[PDB]
Amino acid sequence: SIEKVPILGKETIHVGYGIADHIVREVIANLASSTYVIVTDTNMARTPQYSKLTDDFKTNLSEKRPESRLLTYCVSPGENNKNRATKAAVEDFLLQQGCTRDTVILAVGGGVIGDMIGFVAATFMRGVRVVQVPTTLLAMVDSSVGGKTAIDTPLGKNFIGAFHQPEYVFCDVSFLETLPARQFINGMAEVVKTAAIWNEEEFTRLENFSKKFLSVVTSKKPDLQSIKAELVKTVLESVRVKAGVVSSGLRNLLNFGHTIGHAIEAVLTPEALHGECVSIGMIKEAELSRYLGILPPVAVARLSKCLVAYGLPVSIDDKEFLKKVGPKRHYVEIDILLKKMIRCVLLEKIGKCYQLKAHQVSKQDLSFVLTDEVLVHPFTNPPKENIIVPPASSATYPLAFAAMTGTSCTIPNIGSSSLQGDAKFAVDVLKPMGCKVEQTTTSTTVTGPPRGHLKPLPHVDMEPMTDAFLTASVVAAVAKGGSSTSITGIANQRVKECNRIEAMVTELAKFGVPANELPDGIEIHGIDIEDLKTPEISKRGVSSYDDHRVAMSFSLLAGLCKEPVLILERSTTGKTWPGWWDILHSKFKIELDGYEPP
Amino acid sequence: SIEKVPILGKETIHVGYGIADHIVREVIANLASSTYVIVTDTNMARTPQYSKLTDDFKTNLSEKRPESRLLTYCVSPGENNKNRATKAAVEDFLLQQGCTRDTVILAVGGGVIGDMIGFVAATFMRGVRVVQVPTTLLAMVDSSVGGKTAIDTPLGKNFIGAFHQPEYVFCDVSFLETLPARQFINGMAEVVKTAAIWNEEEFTRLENFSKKFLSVVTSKKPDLQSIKAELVKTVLESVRVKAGVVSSLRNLLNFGHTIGHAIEAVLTPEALHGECVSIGMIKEAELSRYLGILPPVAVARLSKCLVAYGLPVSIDDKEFLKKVGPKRHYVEIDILLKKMIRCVLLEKIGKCYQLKAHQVSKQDLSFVLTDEVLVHPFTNPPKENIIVPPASSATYPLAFAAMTGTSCTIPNSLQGDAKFAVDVLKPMGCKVEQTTTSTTVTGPPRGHLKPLPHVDMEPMTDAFLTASVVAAVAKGGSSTSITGIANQRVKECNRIEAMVTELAKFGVPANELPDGIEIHGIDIEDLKTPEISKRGVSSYDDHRVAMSFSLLAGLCKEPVLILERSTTGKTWPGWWDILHSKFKIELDGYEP
């Protein structure tokens, strides 16, 4: 019943439930000492589990080592006690009880004890032995394993410290009974970190243990005996990940969500905890790897499912999280978060990092996932052939991108076979303006005219193409000429989420293209690719009216200007194609910047 | 040109004179860092040697690494600045300028800077690189080489600290021009330590560099250019001892640091580190002589070198007693054995015995730190012993064989006074077998000595004292009288009154015939003279009374006390080493 983990080739991380009877036997038999010190905090000093540990200690030391002492110190509670005062206070307590280099300091406590009393044990008598007894969940997973000790200067957190390996780490998970429910959700994010970088088989069990975990811990009294045998291996495989990484460039893989998370934690410092900034940072670095085309969109979501099923947040604007921060939230700008930071762990799939290393990402791609608006640079250098897979009404978007640029885009899921009517967009509304269509039975491809030689369809009616229209209006903007592009049969596009017809005639007028509202549709006139294509983003850029189709249609017209066009409400695409902007940067090589209003 | 010493396999201890040009080339080429921090002391920041170093540091960075910085801090002067305050102050200066985890800290200064700023470098960002620039002599020898860094808690000196090896130790001998003459003395003791435990060839050069060193450093201006070529190898071979020992035995560098740390903790700010180590080195060389491992010649040849450097060889030295002043009175052995037992016993000059520390008792340590001796009775001596005295001192272990019955063969007829065997021990009933060289007695079993009626010692005018204590235990009713003692009344102290005063403490009847002494005879039942009785047996500040009454003291039951133990330093300064080692007689010390 003692799950041991080998760190640096030594199984010294003992993990088990209710092992306080075993801790006392093992440490006074192997670690020989005339002096044993148990340093705690005041919260654990009044607990039944710790009075169990000291009482058993003296009634085991009196038998096996009858010329030894047990000393006991109690640090005042708080994370603000991890300073130079308490390190100097407990170091003076050991210099007045006559402690020597043989002493064994049992640092009973969470992360504030396990980092400070390990640092005390590293500097006392040029270094003595320390045995961590972690009593919080975040201490058992990350803080105790590794031997990283530090205290907190006023000018900076975790700066003055030392590397000091513990002789033994006894993660007794029966100490989790007095832990708060918010100190329990906090430490679980350092378990989802180690299952999303190393062990996908652990990540799958962390989905079935979701509401069988959270309903037990957020109860009247947390009876964790109901989840006794299951919670001892949440901590066990989280240590097997960390111990093997600190044993073997690989050690930066445990810093996933600690690049965006340490920026968020440095501006929401006492209110939001560590795991409630790591979990928000893990869901913003999984998006940085999707924007760079390394992670699939499915993983951004399957990582999001596990954090939200644990209480942990996946946005800084989550309403269960905004109550905790409150008035400290308004200091989260991308001007200050990019100064708090750029190496970051880009995931490849759930349970594996890309090339097993941290990658150098720019300040521009980080300025995109941390925002909600987008600057679309012009379409200077697209690849001339591109096979895009949309998850038909999303396929028309890169097909229209090959109509305006005049390149080639093959959507290979659908042909002239499709039951969905939105897949007809190649053969009837892009072929009139001179695009080579080669619609087969499986693929669908356009090849537009070379940069501007579009001719305006006089009149099309869209009886299958109800939500396939706004992308037909942005390709009608480029074709100048007397032929007035007019579309009818757009009757259902009035009530869905915004009246799209008024949405087009308001925003196309910002582009400098003449348009007006036909009684059942739109009348795009069309203007030359560049001559009159300049919006007024300085005042207010193109609003997408909280619709996914407006945000993606006006990103296609934005690349024919010569200065970048701002499209407000970027994240409204999350219900049809949440990574449309990832395709423009990765699959199309169009540079995208983000923007916050000043 | 720039002498380098290998430590832990690699050559990082660069010793040389005036290498401030060489330091700033090597530390900015090999140690790559956007930030170089020179933490100096306020005394060194107003010196031409340090202003040479920083101004050459900036006019070297600007050329070789143009995107790098040089930051300069100034710690307040004093050994009281080695605390948690100044460590936290300079750790806040690094967290203000924006220093990284790769910053190279050039800890310019002595041992106070070299131990604190190295400990700063160990704790700052969990370890950054440190380059020691030692500017005092004791820093170049012990403090910098080794990686031991610490600070000083109020409850104890050098307790909170860490092991942190320096990436480079640039011992510049040209930094010794501004040193005080008292800090020369201080740090010179640590170089003697390393030549008395490891290198006898270095110890002989330290004898010839005696006042060719001391007259130059104690001058109106210390022009060390005159001895520039010899100061650079005083530190070099004293580092080769330290570097090889910390590589591979490390407790051998703690010679004189067991008795010396007891002396330093009672004479703390006045006596320095070397002026208690040198007194401790000369008291652990006597602990090894008392245990019969070191020869008496070495106790003296180690004393010659330290007293020729300004360093003291006793706590009651006159130049040292002015320094400590009123704190001297707290040196009693009750508090010195509390502050201490492992100690390095030397075997000869330049070699430790069995290359390890040995566990000495609290009784043998209570002998060298005192000036009085409590002689336990002669229960179990060896039955045969060959003792080599350095005639008038050969008669003491011969008389020990007369009052016990054993056989002492002094191996070296021609000697005038060495005829104590045949004329004053033989008739009392001793088997005497004087050869051409070996002069030997073999006494009769305990008590059976019969008193010689009239034996006169005209050429043995000193032996009267030794004859008298052996005559005290002899009975038979012949009233032993030894006349013809006329020289002694003027020789040192009047020895004839000194015998009749002190034998009367022993309960033997005696008196003074007009030109001599008249010893009567009592059996083994002879009044032990303790500390209670009139202080104790007073040696009256001459070597004969201290050694003759050590022979009578073993025929009692409860240990006698002899005052002024160290009065024997003119003839046989290790007579008490022979009783414990060569004779197995337990001896312990005593203070009033």
CATH for A16: 3.40.50.1970
Hey, which residues does A15 pair with through a beta bridge?
A3, A171
Q: Alpha-carbon distance B239 to B143, whole Å?
A: 11
Provide the token pair at B443: 């006494």
- Residue of B123, B126, B159 lying closest to A95 (CB–CB): B159
The alpha carbon of residue A16 is apart from the nearest alpha carbon of chain B, in Å, by 31
- Structural tokens at position A291: 């924007």
Is A92 in CB contact (< 8 Å) with chain B?
yes
| SS3 call for B357 | strand
Interchain CB contact of B88 with A (< 8 Å): yes
Of B95, B150, B153, the CB nearest to A159: B95
| Burial of B2: CB neighbours in 10 Å, binned 0-12, 13-18, 19+ | middle
Question: Residue A410 class from Cβ within 10 Å (0-12 exposed, 13-18 middle, 19+ buried)?
Answer: buried
Q: Which of A92, A123, A154 sits opposite B161 (nearest CB)?
A: A123
Give per-residue burial for A294-313: e unless 16+ CB within 10 Å, then b: bbbeebbebbbebbbbbbbb
**CA-angle at A65, arms to A62 and A71, nearest 5°:** 70
In whole angstroms, what is the distance from residue A200 CA to residue A346 CA?
16
* Alpha carbons A351 and B431: distance in angstroms, whole number: 98
Structure tokens at B235: 């530190």
Q: What is the DSSP letter of A108?
A: E
Q: Would you say A296 and A276 are in contact if contact means Cβ atoms under 8 Å apart?
A: no
- Which residues from chain B sit within 8 angstroms of residue A148, using beta carbons? 126
Closest residue in chain A to residue B155, using alpha carbons only? A95
Residue-range definition of the domain harbouring residue B68: 3-183
Let me know whether A172 and A51 are in one domain.
yes
Nearest CA among B341, B351, B317, B319 for reference residue B331:
B317
Q: B225 and B189, same structural domain? A: yes
Residues 294-323 of A with CB under 8 A from B: none
Closest CA relative to residue A73, chosen from A101, A94, A57: A94
Interchain contact, B162 vs A96, CB within 8 Å:
no
- SS3 letters for B285-344? HHHHHHCCCCCHHHHHHHHHHHHCCCCCCCCCCHHHHHHHHHHHHHCCHHHHHHHCCEEE
Q: Do the beta carbons of residue B500 and residue B510 sit within 8 Å? A: yes
Strand partners of residue B150: B161
- Do B129 and B198 fall within a single domain? no
Active site residue A14: no
Catalytic residue among A14, A164, A262, A548: A262
DSSP calls for B376-440: ---SS--SEE------TTTHHHHHHHHTT--EEEE----SSGGGHIIIIITTTT------SS-EE
Strand partners, A488: A461
Four-CA torsion A344, A349, A355, A360, nearest 10 degrees:
-20
Question: Angle CA(B77)–CA(B193)–CA(B107) in degrees, nearest 5?
Answer: 30
Residue of B nearest to A150 (CA): B126
Residue reference for tokens 């075993």: A22
Pairing between β-strand A408-411 and β-strand A385-386 as defined by DSSP bridges: parallel
Is B157 part of the contact surface with chain A (CB cutoff 8 Å)? no
Q: How far is A85 from chain B (nearest CA, A)?
A: 10
* Close Cβ partners of B262 (under 8 Å, ≥ 6 residues apart): B280, B336, B337, B339, B340
Examine the domain organization and report whether A199 and A188 are in the same domain.
no
Query: Residue B133 — left, alpha, or beta (φ > 0 → left; ψ -120 to 50 → alpha)?
Result: beta
Identify the burial level of B154 via C-beta atoms within 10 angstroms of its C-beta, where 0-12 means exposed, 13-18 middle and 19 or more buried. Answer: exposed
Residue positions forming the annotated binding site of B: 41-43, 79-82, 110-112, 115, 126, 135-136, 142, 148, 157-158, 175-178, 186, 190-193, 242, 250-254, 257, 273
Neighbours of A205 (CB within 10 A): 14
Q: Are B544 and B497 in contact (CB under 8 A)?
A: no
Residues B130 and B189 in one domain: no
The SS3 call for residue A331 is: helix
- Which three-class secondary structure state does DSSP give residue B442? strand
Mutation target among B120, B160, B164, B338 for the A interface, most CBs of A within 10 A: B160
* Residues B176, B233 share a domain: no
Nearest CA in chain B to A158: B125
A85 touches chain B (CB under 8 A): no
Phi, psi of A80 (to 5 degrees): -80, -5
Interface probe, candidates B159, B164, B165, B338, chain A, greatest A C-beta count within 10 A? B159
Q: How many DSSP H helices and E strands does chain B contain? A: 22, 21
Gaps after residue numbers in chain B (C–N over 2.5 angstroms): 248, 340, 390, 412
Radius of gyration of chain B (CA): 30
Could you give the CA distance from residue A511 to residue A542 in angstroms, rounded to a whole number? 9
Interface test with B, best of A100, A119, A126 (most B CBs within 10 A): A126
Name, in order, each residue with C-beta under 8 angstroms of B482's C-beta and a sequence gap of 6 or more. B455, B456, B457, B464, B467, B468, B471, B516, B517, B519
Closest CA to A134 of A238, A34, A244: A238
CA B284 to chain centre: 5
Q: Which of A103, A105, A159 to substitute to test the interface with B, most B CBs within 10 Å?
A: A159
Question: Interhelix angle for A182-195 vs A297-308, to 10°?
Answer: 150
Q: How many CB atoms are closer than 10 A to CB A383?
A: 11
Angle, to 10 degrees, between the axis of helix A396-404 and the axis of helix A548-557? 20
Across the interface, whether the CB atoms of B159 and A125 are under 8 A apart is answered yes
B557 at A interface, C-beta within 8 A: no
Q: Which helix (H) or strand (E) holds B143?
A: none
A150–chain B nearest CA distance, Å: 8
Q: Could you tell me the two tokens for B109?
A: 């200064």
Q: Are A49 and A32 in contact (CB under 8 A)?
A: no
Tokens, residue A401: 């991108």
CA distance B152 to chain A (A): 11
CATH of the domain at A242: 1.20.1090.10
Q: Are residues B200 and B262 in contact, defined by beta-carbon separation less than 8 angstroms?
A: no
- Buried b or exposed e, range B286-322, using 16+ CB within 10 angstroms: bbbbbbebbbeebbebbbebbeebbbbbebebeebee
Q: Cα(A529)–Cα(A405) distance, rounded to whole angstroms?
A: 10
Residue with tokens 């942005």: A474
Q: What does the alpha-carbon distance between residue A1 and residue B59 come to, in Å, rounded to a whole number?
A: 66
Dihedral over Cα of B111, B116, B121, B122: its sign:
positive
| Amino acid, single-letter form, for residue A571 | S
- Distance from the B92 Cα atom to the nearest Cα atom in chain A, whole angstroms: 7
A171 and A99, same structural domain? yes
- Chain centroid, CA A132 distance in Å: 30
- DSSP code for B580: I
The reply to whether A241 and A153 lie within a common domain is no
CA distance B160 to chain A (A): 5
Contacts of B465 (CB under 8 A, 6+ apart): B488, B495, B499, B544, B545, B548
Whether residues B222 and B164 share a domain: the answer is: no
The helix (H) or strand (E) run that includes residue A496 is: none
Q: Which residues of B touch A155 (CB under 8 A)?
A: 92, 95-96
B486 DSSP assignment: -
**Are residues B563 and B537 in contact, defined by beta-carbon separation less than 8 angstroms?**
yes
Conformation bin of residue B528: beta by default, left when phi > 0, alpha when psi is -120 to 50: beta
In sign, the C-alpha dihedral spanning A121, A127, A128, A134 is positive
Task: Please check whether residue B338 touches A, CB under 8 A.
Answer: no
What's the length of chain A?
598
Interface A–B counts its CB contacts (< 8 A) at: 56
Distance CA B386, CA A570 (A): 105
Beta partners for A360? A343
| Paired strand residues for B439 | B410
The whole-angstrom distance between B495's CA and the closest CA on chain A is: 53
User: Which of B123, B148, B159 lies closest to A160 in CB terms?
Assistant: B123
For chain B, say whether A124 makes contact (Cβ under 8 Å).
yes
Let me know if A95 is exposed, middle or buried by CB neighbors in 10 A (0-12, 13-18, 19+).
middle
Shared domain for B138 and B252, answered yes or no, is: no
For CA atoms B440, B442, B447, B448, give the dihedral sign.
negative
B395-402 and B543-552 are packed helices; what angle lies between their axes, rounded to 10 degrees? 20
Q: Are residues A187 and A214 in the same domain?
A: no
Using CA atoms, how far apart are residues A160 and A480, in angstroms rounded to an integer? 67
Task: Give which of A242, A284, A237 is closest to A262, Cα–Cα.
Answer: A284
Cα–Cα nearest to A562, from A598, A523, A539, A528: A528
One-letter identity of residue A371: T
How many CB atoms are located within 10 Å of the residue A254 CB?
Answer: 21
Nearest to A161 among B123, B155, B160 (CB): B123
**Resolution of the entry in angstroms:** 3.4
The contacts of residue B485 (CB under 8 Å, 6+ apart) are B457, B461, B464, B495, B496, B515, B516, B517
What's the gap between Cα A240 and its chain centre? 22
CB contact under 8 A, A161 and B84: no
Bridge-based pairing state of the strands A35-41 and A69-75: parallel
Phi, psi of B406 (to 5 degrees): -80, -170
Diameter over CA atoms, chain A: 105
Number of other CB atoms surrounding residue B191 within 10 Å: 25
> Is residue A306 within 8 Å of residue A286, measured between CB atoms?
no
Residues B108, B175: Cα–Cα separation, whole Å: 10
Q: For residues B219 and B222, what is the distance between their CA atoms, to the nearest angstrom?
A: 6
> From CA A497, how far away is CA A546, in angstroms rounded?
8
- CA contacts within 13 A on the Cβ side of A278: 22
Helix or strand (DSSP H, E) at B246: helix B236-247
The string over A171-191, giving b where at least 16 C-beta atoms fall within 10 Å of a residue's C-beta and e elsewhere, is: bbbbbbebbeeebbbbbbbbb
Phi, psi of A162 (to 5 degrees): -155, 155
Contact B22, B16 (CB under 8 A): yes
Burial A545-570 (b: 16+ CB within 10 A, else e): bebbbbbbbbbbbbbbbeebbbbbbb
For chain A, what is the total number of helices (H) and then of strands (E)? Answer: 23, 23
- Cα–Cα distance for residue pair A478/A512, rounded to 1 Å: 11
Residue B363 near residue B588 (C-beta atoms within 8 A): yes
The verdict on A111 and A226 lying in the same domain is no
Cα separation, B397 vs B387, in Å, equals 7
- Report the amino acid identity of residue A96: Q
Contacts 24+ apart (CB under 8 A), B121-125: B121/B149, B121/B164, B122/A162, B122/B149, B122/B162, B122/B163, B122/B164, B123/A123, B123/A160, B123/A161, B123/A162, B123/B91, B123/B162, B124/A159, B124/A160, B124/B91, B124/B94, B124/B99, B125/A159, B125/B99, B125/B100, B125/B101
Q: Which residue in A has a C-alpha nearest to residue B162's C-alpha?
A: A126
Residue A155 to residue B92, Cβ atoms within 8 A:
yes
The answer to whether B341 touches B258, Cβ cutoff 8 Å, is yes
How far is the C-alpha of B120 from the C-alpha of B107, rounded, in Å? Answer: 10
Of B91, B95, B162, which is closest to A123 when you measure between CB atoms?
B162
Instruction: Give yes or no for B123 touching A (CB within 8 A).
Output: yes
Residue of B377, B368, B395 lying closest to B543 (CA atoms)? B395
Asked if B340 reaches chain A (Cβ–Cβ under 8 Å), the answer is no
**Which amino acid belongs to residue B387?**
I
Report the alpha-carbon distance of residue B245 to residue B239 in Å, rounded: 10
> How large is the greatest C-alpha to C-alpha distance in chain B, in angstroms?
104
